[PDB]
Point group: C2
Chain length 136, copies 2
């Protein structure tokens, strides 16, 4: 019941992006420029199907520097990971929730079996616990 | 001697992003959240390899809205497209330059054969007229 490191996620489908600036309620620790990625499996859910076991969503969080009215991507802060397994991740609505510090497999961030992550993602039960909307 | 609309570019490898805000010298018309994408042939070039004919880079430019210490993606403004053909686009350094308003295939923007585009990109001769760098 550990979430696997999503090897190769940077080659996945880019779902969407958002900037969370200082002062945002989620600034600790979501502050930065973030990009949402989906594997083949997760695309099926985003398109309006059921999320199949093996679907993985990644949220890739970068620091940024405001440089003359450009926001410029700096170092990666972390990745958040949601891993669909209806049986193994049953306690958290069938998604496994993990963080990797600087996107490194060695730096697991989740210490409460993902109940905190699940606490907020539960509001989205009707879209299978997923906030991001697939956009053209 | 026309740049092909890059059908399916939303499914390609996401290279990088940047935000250009009010007050940036490039605000008009490059203002917004932009995402750079690369087809397989473009990735060869970006990796430090050479760009094969048929390499395509896309810059996808979104309007954004302020939303309580968040910049949220709004409407697509346009896409910019560079298509590799050393022979057919030799007047603009082996890349064909085109813009599509709102990313629509029917709203081609470039009127000067891409000389305007090439004029700025020519700064980057030493990285084959590409600004963007592959990051992890
Ligand atoms: C609310 C107080 C949140 C808590 C706690 C967590 N997440 Fe979340 N998450 C939240 C929002 C509003 C979004 C959407 C961002 C966007 O650009 O629209 C997200 C997104 C994710 C994603 C991308 C998939 C999706 O649901 O859109 C992942 C992979 C994700 N979050 C993981 C994650 C983990 C591992 C958490 C605990 C450490 C976690 N989130 C907490 C809101 C909230
Ligand atoms: C300088 C005044 C520019 C002019 C005029 C044009 N472009 Fe450009 N382009 C510019 C920069 C600084 C960047 C990098 C942005 C980043 O996030 O790093 C770009 C990028 C592109 C891309 C992505 C590929 C790359 O070189 O990084 C494409 C596909 C692209 N630009 C196309 C484009 C076209 C079609 C133009 C004429 C309409 C054009 N550019 C003008 C700077 C400048
Ligand atoms: Zn405020
Ligand atoms: Zn500014």
């Amino acid at each position: 019941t550990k979430v696997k490191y999503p090897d190769g996620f940077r080659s996945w489908y880019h779902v969407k992006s958002m900037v969370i600036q200082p002062g945002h309620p989620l600034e600790n620790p979501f502050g930065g420029i973030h990009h949402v990625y989906a594997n083949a499996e997760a695309i099926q859910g985003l398109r309006g199907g059921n999320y199949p076991d093996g679907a993985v969503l990644v949220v890739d969080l970068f620091d940024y520097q405001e440089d003359n009215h450009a926001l410029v991507e700096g170092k990666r802060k972390l990745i958040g990971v949601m891993e669909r397994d209806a049986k193994r991740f049953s306690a958290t609505g069938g998604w496994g929730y993990e963080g990797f510090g600087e996107g490194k497999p060695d730096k697991r961030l989740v210490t409460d079996g993902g109940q905190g992550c699940f606490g907020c993602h539960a509001a989205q039960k009707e879209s299978q616990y997923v906030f991001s909307r697939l956009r053209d």
